Design an enzyme around this catalytic site. Structure first.
Site: not given
Lengths: 277, 52, 156, 177, 140, 104, 140, 140, 52
Positions: E6-8
């Site tokens: 999850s790149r957040v």
């Protein structure tokens, strides 16, 4: 995914080199540790033609020794003698016999606990870390003497050749607790001997039984070590044949997928060129 | 297959004489299932493998 | 494959190259450390086929020194970034060039072989390695003190 | 008095009644030798078979005519039809006689059987032939052992074994012809 | 989870789970390598067996049924109950049924405050960990 | 690669139970009996669930593997497990009192 | 034989060959199974050794020479002589001699009765059992 | 070396290198059979250890240092010294400096004879052989 | 992995027979005699059959 097949080919190829090297390592360690087994096979004989051979004795207390391997690519030797250990730790029981379960080797403590954890007492390991010496087997026999049983039970693989290994049950009777009693046949066959020791028979049979335990234990953990080596040598030539068959099948599969990806890419290029031509 | 068999069918024995072919074969990608040796090997009546 | 082990920045130490990795531009004490790190890491990547099935017990304690040295170098190549404080947990570290070369020259030649391998994970330079090491030692010597209270009757 | 009639033949048949039939009967170390005690013979005249053993070596397995054995009472001899005896051995010299020749093994202490059929079994622990022994280190180790007299019976017994072993070894390397 | 990202980051993770599940994926990172090596079962370390034991507690924890979405506060307590040790010594075949004890037998008042604050306050950090011992667990 | 001899005890358990349920998913068909010879076995659903539940729980570890192969349900498993055992005695005794004299 | 299938010709093949070949396919399946189980020689169980020898007996029976097709009546008898007894004395090497010995030495009217009937009647089974006992087998 | 070929061959090799590279390539081929088996160090064969230690001598012998091309007499003296056995004293990690400690130690009057004649003549095969024993190798 | 004198006598007879057939498949060539010195030998067919 066409580099997944190539890295699998890399994996199986280096595995088939590793096991081809370990077969030669085991074959090197078998040939110099075959002569120390043959030098040890003589000394067990005077005590077995002297103390007799008495496995089915109504011992009040017993110690079992299942001497196993330490490293675990042997090919079912330690499991075989663990099954023999349970098949003799159900056979010898006739009176509610207390048994001490003692295993020599790291692959004995992990299986005899799965078979008999309540009576499991001692674990000896790293007994093949340099070589097997009689001082070491004497110290293990002295630790088996800290239990004062009425018999000792020895489970090891009799190395016959580089193929045949038979599990052997060998017994050692404690001197006045059962050893002089089990010779009492219509009288006694032990009193035909002239004891020439310093003290009485009660501490020449004690010394001689401790020596017989040391000799049986030393020959057991030498002969089982040579069985370990000569069974790993044939359990690492089935790994090479399995890694060769899988490399043959995977090489065939990789060639099929290589041809298929050249054809698929070609059909894509022609389909893209014909929509403009 | 027909461009190979246009060559390899004139190499045969007639009633006059015979032509016998010793043809060097390159297996392309260590692949005998490649269609160039899979088509070539159909005509081959012997092999002679020289080894190092 | 570097990033699945958690080493971030996930630079492959072997496949990454430069034209400044010439010994007559960056000196010999930099070039020799870089090539020695690459040699230890490629030796360990050669070892990983016999490690993975046998288990680091038949390696004559020359290859085991190589495995421990390579694992320390692999963890020490990781560095918590100043822009990645949002992700994991750690304030970022700027590691100056001389401290990097001295630290990897220390790990490379056996000056820090007595330090544990996870004290190198996500630390700035080689004195932060020892500062995380002693702190971990204090943590283990203080882990077993709290199992006697905090079970009932707090101080309101 | 023989209430447990055990053996290499009885455990196989009482093992048929408890072990699963997938497991073949386990072997016993009496299966791997042909020499026993009770069975007569093995003499054929003058020479009787000796079985000199040691854990790591077998120094003799052929036949001899007479053995000189360092008993704990002293160096005795056995002929072919000798009486059954079990002899604890002092640190001394075994001599195997086959004729004019003889081999001079210095052993460290063990046992020596003569069995009721006349077969003998010299079972020692460390046995060096008298050629490869030095007369140098024995004097220094004896002198180091003859001065340290502690109080503990363990080290007193160990040092007494050192005195007796080194005294007999110097006595057997001194008067050699 | 070895290939899931999850790149957040943890910018938009629930704060009552940003602190609990940070050490969840650490112990599953330790679980993913020691369990493939012990698929052979070559040697034992007896502490690598522990991180193979606890990582398999957390795999059975993260199982879920089909149309049962657990809100957020009953997910952070069911991972507080495993990352703070409470579901250790509970049998691995029975963690999927031992965690209905954590949703039922723990006080419904501990979820109302944890949803309201969003972070395990120290007046809840110890008060809920005192109530994770006051539950009946199968096997026990 | 390594064989069954280097598996754990629970993995030998998994391999044995999985070989048994691999055989137990097979069944003879009523329409394949014209070339296999084995008559076809319709299996009810409750028999299927009870049988596979019994193999899973360990009620049939003492049975061999091929007793599960090409049978209807777990009653026929034990029918073939006995029939399979019986042929391990009788392989002989077909020498005399036959129907192969010359005159009769 | 494990991969060769022909379904439509079955229940349309030769009746005598159908009598004697179901057990042929059966014992070759047993031979391929007892060869797949013990692929390398370490353990001699001696109860599979009957199957491991009868399988090689039948396999050496099945192979034949090129450009020499056999009539079906001289083939039912030759496989009767292997699926039954009558060739368990001959070792493995002279089965290509024993097959022509069985074919030449037997009464040639057995082949006529077999070809006319299609199946091996008990009257023909009796004389086939008789004439296959008195043949001079080469393994002797 | 396993895949690098030259279809011309040694017909266009410098003689004097052809006398020693003919055994260098053979021992490197033996090492390539014996490589990836060297992680089993304690469990020796003492004859495959000979080809292992010699191949590890010759592998570190052949390394160069980025735009320092070596004249051909210095190359053939290098593989003479490593091939004949003058560098079995040196451990595997100091042969990049043992070859540097040959060219600086052997007098440069042999190099122009080796360049001029273009072979290792037996007078020179005694001279430069005797010169490699008065070499101060960095050995321990 | 075992040694030369480990195998049996009837097998080492085939080791010697193979080591002297493997040598006997060698042949000197007529077109090689300008750069070997040793002359070449043309071998008849039935001669090869009988000599093997």
């Amino acid at each position: 995914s066409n580099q997944a097949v190539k890295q699998r080919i890399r994996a199986i190829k280096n595995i088939g080199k590793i096991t081809k090297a370990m077969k030669m390592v085991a074959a090197s360690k078998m040939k110099n540790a075959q002569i120390a087994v043959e030098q040890s096979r003589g000394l067990v004989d005077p005590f077995v033609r002297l103390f007799g051979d008495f496995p089915a004795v109504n011992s009040n207390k017993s110690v079992v020794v299942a001497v196993t391997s330490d490293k675990g690519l042997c090919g079912g030797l330690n499991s075989n003698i663990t099954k023999y250990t349970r098949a003799t730790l159900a056979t010898t029981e006739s009176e509610g016999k207390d048994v001490v379960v003692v295993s020599i080797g790291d692959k004995g403590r992990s299986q005899l606990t799965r078979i008999e954890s309540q009576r499991y007492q001692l674990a000896i390991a790293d007994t093949y870390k340099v070589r097997v010496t009689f001082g070491q087997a004497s110290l293990i026999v002295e630790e088996l003497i800290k239990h004062n049983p009425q018999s000792y039970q020895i489970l090891f693989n009799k190395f016959r050749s580089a193929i045949s290994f038979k599990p052997t049950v060998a017994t050692i009777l404690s001197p006045d607790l059962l050893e002089k009693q089990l010779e009492d046949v219509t009288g006694n066959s032990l009193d035909a001997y002239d004891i020439e020791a310093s003290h009485e028979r009660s501490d020449v049979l004690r010394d001689l039984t401790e020596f017989h335990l040391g000799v049986t234990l030393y020959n057991a953990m030498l002969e089982n070590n040579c069985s370990e080596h000569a069974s790993r040598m044939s359990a690492m030539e089935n790994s090479t044949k399995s890694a060769g068959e899988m490399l043959g099948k995977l090489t065939l599969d990789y060639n099929r997928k290589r041809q298929a990806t050249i054809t698929t890419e070609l059909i894509e290029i022609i389909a893209g060129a014909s929509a403009l031509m | 297959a027909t461009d190979l068999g246009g060559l390899q069918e004139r190499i045969t024995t007639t009633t006059k004489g015979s032509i016998t072919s010793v043809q060097a074969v390159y297996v392309p990608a260590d692949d005998l299932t490649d269609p160039a040796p899979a088509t070539t090997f159909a005509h081959l009546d012997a092999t002679t493998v020289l080894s190092r | 494959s570097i990033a699945e082990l958690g080493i971030y920045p996930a630079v492959d130490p072997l496949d990454s190259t430069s034209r400044m990795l010439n010994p007559n531009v960056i000196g010999a004490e930099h070039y020799n450390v870089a090539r020695g790190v690459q040699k230890v890491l490629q030796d360990y990547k050669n070892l990983q086929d016999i490690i993975a099935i046998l288990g680091m017990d038949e390696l004559s304690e020359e290859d085991k020194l190589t495995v421990a040295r390579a694992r320390k170098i692999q963890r020490f190549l990781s560095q918590p970034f100043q822009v990645a404080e949002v992700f994991t947990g750690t304030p970022g570290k700027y590691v100056d060039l001389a401290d990097t070369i001295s630290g990897f020259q220390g790990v490379l030649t056996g000056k820090y072989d007595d330090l544990p391998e996870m004290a190198f994970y996500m630390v700035g330079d080689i004195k932060e390695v020892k500062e995380k090491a002693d702190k971990m030692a204090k943590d283990i010597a203080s882990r077993k003190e709290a199992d006697n209270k905090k079970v009932s009757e707090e101080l309101k | 008095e023989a209430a447990a009639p055990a053996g290499p033949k009885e455990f196989t048949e009482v093992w048929n009644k408890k072990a699963p039939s997938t497991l073949i009967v386990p072997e016993f170390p009496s299966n791997y030798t042909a020499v026993k005690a009770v069975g007569e013979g093995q003499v054929h005249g003058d020479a009787f078979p000796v079985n000199f053993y040691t854990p790591h070596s077998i120094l003799s397995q052929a036949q001899k005519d007479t053995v000189v054995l360092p008993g704990v009472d002293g160096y005795f001899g056995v002929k072919a039809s000798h009486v059954p005896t079990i002899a604890q051995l002092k640190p001394g010299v075994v001599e195997l006689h086959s004729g004019a020749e003889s081999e001079k093994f210095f052993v460290s202490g063990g046992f020596a059987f003569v069995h009721p059929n006349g077969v003998t079994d010299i079972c020692v622990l460390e046995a060096a032939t008298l050629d490869q022994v030095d007369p140098a280190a024995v004097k220094s180790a004896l002198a180091a052992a003859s001065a340290a007299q502690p109080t503990d019976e363990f080290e007193q017994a160990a040092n007494r074994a050192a005195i007796e072993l080194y005294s007999a070894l110097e006595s057997a390397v001194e008067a050699k012809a | 989870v070895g290939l899931s990202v999850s790149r957040v980051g943890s910018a938009a993770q629930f704060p009552g789970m940003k602190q609990v599940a940070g050490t969840l994926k650490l112990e599953l990172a330790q679980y993913r390598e020691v369990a493939a090596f012990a698929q052979f079962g070559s040697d034992l370390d007896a502490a690598t067996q522990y991180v193979l034991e606890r990582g398999a507690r957390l795999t059975e924890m993260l199982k879920q049924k089909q149309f049962a979405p657990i809100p957020i506060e009953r997910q952070t307590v069911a991972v507080y109950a495993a990352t703070k040790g409470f579901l250790d010594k509970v049998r691995v075949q029975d963690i999927v049924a031992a965690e209905e004890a954590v949703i039922s037998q723990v006080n419904p008042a501990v979820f109302k405050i944890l949803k309201a604050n969003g972070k395990i306050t120290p007046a809840l950090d110890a008060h809920l960990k005192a109530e994770l011992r006051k539950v009946k667990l199968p096997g026990a």
